[PDB]
Amino acid sequence: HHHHHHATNLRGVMAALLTPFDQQQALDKASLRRLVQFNIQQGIDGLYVGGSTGEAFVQSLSEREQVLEIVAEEAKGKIKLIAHVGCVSTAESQQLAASAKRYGFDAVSAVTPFYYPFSFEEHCDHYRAIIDSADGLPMVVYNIPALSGVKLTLDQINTLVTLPGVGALKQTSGDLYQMEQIRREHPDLVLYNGYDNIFASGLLAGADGGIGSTYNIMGWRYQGIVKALKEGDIQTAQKLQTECNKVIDLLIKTGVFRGLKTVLHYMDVVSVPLCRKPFGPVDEKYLPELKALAQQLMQERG
Amino acid sequence: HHHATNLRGVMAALLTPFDQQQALDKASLRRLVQFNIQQGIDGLYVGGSTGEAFVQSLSEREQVLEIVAEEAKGKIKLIAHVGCVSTAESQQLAASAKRYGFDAVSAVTPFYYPFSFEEHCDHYRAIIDSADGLPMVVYNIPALSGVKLTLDQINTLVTLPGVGALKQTSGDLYQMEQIRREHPDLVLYNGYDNIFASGLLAGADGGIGSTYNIMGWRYQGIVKALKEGDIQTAQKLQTECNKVIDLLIKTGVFRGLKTVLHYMDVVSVPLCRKPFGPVDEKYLPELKALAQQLMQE
């Protein structure tokens, strides 16, 4: 499918960008800019902006557009930029897609619309409408059954990823039989592994990249896994995945987004490491570990 | 809980009319509000799931809340569903509900992202504060929210200061009985229309539901029949409601209700917002026949 061929340039390891907030839970613009540069300096292939990790679903459309605009100013032409524009509403999703186009993003993406049960035909129309509003930007279908409640069959996934204008699939599923099945059906499809804690295994199963939240603090590790596997150095790939999972273990305990924001706070990137309500603060007993992790990561990096 | 005793009854979960451009249809909203008042409904639950809240902006939700208050304040009870995923957004809507003179606020357990139980409690606390004296109706709908509260957690939520009711959209009638047993004075709304009679028997003392927009009097009739010990009439009414619900599930529930209301000369354009699609045209004869049946009744 030629739409898959035309999206070849989107293959890679893309950080799901966090949205920094200030003490009053408004956008912290200076921290957002610092975070974008910090990701570029890690050697990340691109950014996935306004996704789950960006706390999109506790932001308004206007807030999401501001983030999109700022990220484009900072990063357009330097690394790939995918705009997650998905809302429950098709119309809202289209507005964000239109804005992504205006700001010069390389792609758009939409989570399968959630809360209300929609038919598969309704899902397909949703993506079509957003693709039209994206005005040439390729679409990354975003599948995350754990949070969306949307339970697509493989046949449905196949239809979705071959809609005109779709160039990739962000597969946030731990089912690696299905990962292999998708690769086998679509040999040229850009296929992002969505769960960071199985990245090496997802690549082996057929993913050709990833999009993840933990890439913000250790994206070079995931780059290092791609490299190890390409060279056939399985031991280095396993070692890196194991180190990633030790960190993921801690972030699951602390809360993932806020744990990441706190680590980035000790890396001097984020000024105030809060998520938006109803997310609460990181428990203070985890602070030594998170600071320790921040120190560990800079020392292996710098 | 005995304070909020005035919130007991059968409250329609109000639909939000739209036009073919997907804009709010305010004329049809007003007509639908009056249609519900004329049916003898006890109140309206505004901007809930049935109201298509989660495909509207805050401004749109506020516009609807305002119009309903204009139409119905003082005539029937008004509950504003103000729930968003965001606490701050939910607080804005709660403050607006207060301004418009609603009798109560409500919020669905915040969804998509997993939140801890403590995070849920703080969310409700913050909204109650912004409601500034309006009692809170905790809204539990596990099937759509993905939030799996334990009974003990439900107990903690419903006894938070400012909480006067639970909207229990759950088919587990053991838990319905357990909630009634623990909280003898709690206003407890049955949320699944197709078990209303059984929910009342288990302990609910009223309900909030989408199908009440077209046949609210049948649910009042179940309440009446059960108060008089007339099981047979209660069962017959529930069976008739379920015959309708079978059809609505086939057609799509919100858009089916809006189509019935369209044939009743209430709603101009029976559309839901995208990504909801239109009613399959093969169902229109059944939906029209139903409107006629219900009007004659």
Add this chain to the structure above:
Amino acid sequence: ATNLRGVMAALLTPFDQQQALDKASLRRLVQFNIQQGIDGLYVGGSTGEAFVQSLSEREQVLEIVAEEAKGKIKLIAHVGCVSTAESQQLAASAKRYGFDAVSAVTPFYYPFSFEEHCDHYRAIIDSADGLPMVVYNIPALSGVKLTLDQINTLVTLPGVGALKQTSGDLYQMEQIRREHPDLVLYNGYDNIFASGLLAGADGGIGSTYNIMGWRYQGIVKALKEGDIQTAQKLQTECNKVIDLLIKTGVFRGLKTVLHYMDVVSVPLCRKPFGPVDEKYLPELKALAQQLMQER
């Protein structure tokens, strides 16, 4: 199938200190149930710990219960196994012992297609040799998720006279009743019995009927007479007991209550079920005394 309508205790299987069948306690439990005014017994079901018994042990229980109670109350033999052939054996034995009906749980563990489920029931019905089949639906334990349409096909199979509906979905209970006005339809979850009857069930089969079957008969009566408050009160009292039994473990909690009622010598379930925690013994003792004083 109309004569199968009613309130039937899901009989427990008493065991001795060595986990073998305690035949004397079994006989005592059967009589105890008859004296409570139960309409019948459902023997060798989930509650009977069927799935930790051999086929010969299950036959032994069936034979003895028939000795005790045949002619006096209705007797339904749960003959269900994963294996069809094993299920057929028990069905043939039920017929020999003179049971009024057979029953089989949807076969579990391995996923079977719906037509495989249908063939399974057909085979068991053939082996039942004229005994009506009670289809037994319990999704929470069986893992089998039948659609309403599939339930409709199952309950209309030649030879099927009833459905034991162990589901808390009371929309579906009403739908089943509406589709099949004459079907015998047993409410399976004790803790919604009053509500299940209201939705369309015309009786029930349950584990807690062994210790308070008269309360459920009382709910049927109260509803028949339009005494909704009495029905609700009885359901509430049943649910207070069910709360405790869920804490203690239901089969062993029931056996322990029956032990304090002088019916069951040794109130053990079969391994891997463990014993009742000793800290719940005062509550279960208090419960037996209350129920005995209640009659």
Add this chain to the structure above:
Amino acid sequence: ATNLRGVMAALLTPFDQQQALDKASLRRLVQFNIQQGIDGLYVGGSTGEAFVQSLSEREQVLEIVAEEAKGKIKLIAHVGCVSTAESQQLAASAKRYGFDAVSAVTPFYYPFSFEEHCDHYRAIIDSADGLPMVVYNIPALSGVKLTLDQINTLVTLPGVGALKQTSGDLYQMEQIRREHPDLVLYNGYDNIFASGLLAGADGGIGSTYNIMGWRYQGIVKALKEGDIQTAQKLQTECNKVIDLLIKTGVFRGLKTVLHYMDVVSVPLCRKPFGPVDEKYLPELKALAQQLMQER
């Protein structure tokens, strides 16, 4: 328990058109596996249709397999039942027949507490009298949802030497390996074998190894050689076969391929399993021919 590390076929149990054990085909299937170069056999498991056989039938199969294979390849006896006592009888029999290890699925149908699962394993381990235990985790069929902490407790019980992990959660696979660097850890889902090895499994137990065990051994080899492309190519070929087997039904599909390889006389599973849809026979025959020519 390093000696248990490897690629072990979950042996199918052949039956005839009467649904009786086909012992001649069992012996042939055992020999066929040995000649494929399999490391061992896991006997009377899910794939062996344990849960539609009597204890005696399961014992007969265990005895025959030991006769054919003892000392030539590793032998693991799946002795698991819902009942602890039944599981203990099979464990004692496995010991008598000279098996290298025993295994038990988490007991299913009735909800048991985690303590009750542990005591179940302790009892089976005692009856195995020195044979190491392979804890068998298969959430999708058993309905038992163990936490990582619970799995950690189980795999460290005295006498446990391995975990059969039939779960597609490869985060947990990695976590288990991280916690227990020396634990024998079998990948249970054949269609993610290469990925499970990468996450931390050090071998596997699977149903499809009966017809293409050498491919899985080839994946283990390719990964140790650091040849990722060959590991992927092999996994892709295994999944093309698995796609077909899932369409046909896996056990009966495997038996049908084996039939065309002249190993199994009658490719039937026991009722309530039905026969293969005849429209799939051309595909299943061609697969047999392909696989015979490849080996």
